[PDB]
Amino acid sequence: VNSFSGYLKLTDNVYIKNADIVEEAKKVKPTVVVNAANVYLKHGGGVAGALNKATNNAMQVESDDYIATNGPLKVGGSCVLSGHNLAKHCLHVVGPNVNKGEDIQLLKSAYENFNQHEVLLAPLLSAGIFGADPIHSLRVCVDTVRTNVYLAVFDKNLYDKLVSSFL
């Protein structure tokens, strides 16, 4: 039993809810919140900008030190940093950005990072301003993640479409 509430169950391990992932992290304080990161951990907009803003820019400060030490992530890769006031940990995962021409096959590799954590609060990778089809992202998520994932979808219209079209 866990504290996530009001989710629709899609499969044995994947749950989804129309919710602002920022509001959901503050309320649950999950062990892991996933950020929709880029390779530079520059949290400007979309999900990333929102999570960083909620940390009063502490996420960005920590991220800049991480990059200065380690260099950029790989597309499809991840790193674990602090969850600040939102979660114990933040798993920064880089999905391909279609608006940069990145290979959509990297989306499966990106979701494989979730398998290193037993339970996660997460957004759909590569959706929103990353430019991929969210229906496809959900399919890849279900078919790749084996650990327990609770997906927050900000847009109600999109949430309904994801549920209604789910096979």
Ligand SMILES: O=C(Nc1ccc(C(=O)N[C@@H]2c3cccc(O)c3C[C@@H]2C(=O)O)c(O)c1)NC1CC1
């Ligand atoms: O500002 C926020 N939250 C917040 C959450 C998500 C996002 C975001 O961009 N989502 C993305 C989005 C939007 C529309 C269609 C989409 O396919 C996606 C993918 C992604 C998502 O929905 O996962 C955001 O811009 C801000 N909270 C403050 C009031 C406290």
